[PDB]
């Protein structure tokens, strides 16, 4: 079934590599509208990359970089230290685009 | 900034409709999108995505969609975070649908 | 740069298979995807989008899909331009599909 | 049925102004999207958003587009945009 996600945003932090081996960062995607006082909210979207795509993100992207992301939405579920269940939704990037020279 | 999500899937359960303290309709359902590839043993697994609609979009999805209905969703990916009963910080990301298309 | 198209529609005709100078099979069909809004005349028009598939995916669409089959298409949008006898130009726009989903039974 | 197109590229010229028979304003530009050789995709915007694009974007500017795909006739298919997002 069809599953497609496209985002442009800026990384909140420097990307992490993680593992089997996965590259990870979170993208702040400003909304296109504001309230009457110009306050603009954002969404903080976790993205995961693999292989050379994971390598490209590690060598090009840093805190604050504007990036383009194209992928699938995948959901998983785990339990943590305190004994709580966490519901995870993320973008698994099929192609990431560095939008800055 | 660009924010676009398009999915096709089937509802896992029947949709729920509600009215905020302010009296606008909010519709909720979860969409199961089978993957296009297979896992290490040849299984095709699914993803279970929470979708949100408002206003007439929420009404029409409530009266027309039921458990198992094939639907296409066009919208944006939005993130929230709250502190629920047990006392947890819970991070929710969900699809806010600009248009739901009844495919059956 | 990002280039992304997601469509659902019904095939206008039955799909075509062909095999290039090299051997690879190329699948061809065009999709009628009705608009979500209405015209000044109160009913619903569609847009007719050419789709291109390759390799085994193109085989399946030839073996499974027919005129009227509802299908979903995911891919990238391509533009090229070439000619013919009247050596003047044909402007083609199409979607080359990364994945097709057959939304009806067969 | 679903019809969504999302691109990022650069305008080949400055966007143009124009209006329909019924006086509605239209802004056009063609978008040079890069493969990863380019694709050259015409984009249409409407009403006030045409005033937006004409002020914000010029030849070479990096814009993202989000919208529907539409056919017209001389066959022509364009991207009717729901929002152009000025990135540079």
| DSSP state at residue A13 | S
A97 interfaces chain C, CB cutoff of 8 Å: yes
A78 interfaces chain B, CB cutoff of 8 Å: no
How far apart, in Å, are the Cα atoms of D70 and each of B69, C48, C58, D13, D81? 28, 8, 25, 22, 10
Q: Show me where the domains of chain D are located.
A: 1-88
What is the distance between the alpha carbons of residues A33 and A21, in angstroms, rounded to a whole number?
A: 37
CB A96 within 8 A of CB A69: yes
For B2-29, give one letter per residue: b (16+ CB within 10 A) or e: bbbbbbbbbbeeebeeeeeeeeebebbb
CB D51 within 8 A of CB D29: no
What is the distance between the alpha carbons of residues B48 and B25, in angstroms, rounded to a whole number?
A: 23
Token look-up 């943590």 returns: A80
CATH 2.40.50.140 fits C1-106, yes or no: yes
The pair of structure tokens assigned to B31 is 């969409």
What is the distance between the alpha carbons of residues C6 and D4, in angstroms, rounded to a whole number?
A: 5
What is the distance between the alpha carbons of residues B7 and B35, in angstroms, rounded to a whole number?
A: 11
- Chain C contact probe: residue of D2, D3, D36, D44 with most C CBs at under 10 A: D3
What is the distance between the alpha carbons of residues C2 and D7, in angstroms, rounded to a whole number?
A: 5
Please enumerate in sequence order all residues whose Cβ is within 8 A of that of A32, keeping only pairs 6 or more positions apart, or say none.
B1, B3, D83, D85
CATH topology of domain D1-88: OB fold (Dihydrolipoamide Acetyltransferase, E2P) (2.40.50)
For A70-80, give one letter per residue: b (16+ CB within 10 A) or e: bbbbbbeeeee
Strands A85-98 and A42-50: parallel
Considering the four listed CATH numbers 2.40.50.140, 2.102.10.10, 1.10.30.50, 1.10.1370.20, the one that applies to the domain covering A1-101 is 2.40.50.140
In the CATH scheme, what architecture does the domain B1-104 have? Beta Barrel (2.40)
**Is C85 in a helix, a strand, or coil?**
coil
What is the distance between the alpha carbons of residues C25 and C18, in angstroms, rounded to a whole number?
A: 5
Q: How was this structure determined?
A: X-ray
> Pick from C44, C27, C35: which is nearest to C7 by CA?
C35
Helix (H) or strand (E) holding C55: helix C55-64
What is the distance between the alpha carbons of residues B93 and B91, in angstroms, rounded to a whole number?
A: 7
CB C83 within 8 A of CB C100: no
**DSSP, residue by residue, D17-80:** EEE-TT--EEEEEEEEEE---EEEEEEEEEHHHHHHHHHH--TT-EEEEEEEEEEE---EEEEE
Number of Cβ pairs closer than 8 Å across A and C?
21
Helix (H) or strand (E) holding A59: helix A51-60
> Pick from B68, B72, B20, B82: which is nearest to B51 by CA?
B72
Number of Cβ pairs closer than 8 Å across A and D?
16
Which other chains touch chain C, taking contact as 3+ CB pairs less than 8 Å apart? A, B, D
The pair of structure tokens assigned to A33 is 């509208």
Please enumerate in sequence order all residues whose Cβ is within 8 A of that of C78, keeping only pairs 6 or more positions apart, or say none.
C52, C93, C94, C95, C96, D39
């Amino acid at each position: 079934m069809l599953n497609r996600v496209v985002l442009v945003g800026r990384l909140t932090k420097d990307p992490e590599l993680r593992s089997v081996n996965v590259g990870t960062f979170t993208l702040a995607v400003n909304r296109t509208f504001t309230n009457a006082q110009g306050e603009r909210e954002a969404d903080f979207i976790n993205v995961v990359v693999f292989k050379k795509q994971a390598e490209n993100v590690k060598n090009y992207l840093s805190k604050g970089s504007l990036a383009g992301v194209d992928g699938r939405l995948q959901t998983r579920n785990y339990e943590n230290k305190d004994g709580q269940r966490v519901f995870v939704t993320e973008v698994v990037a099929d192609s990431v685009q560095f939008l800055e020279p």
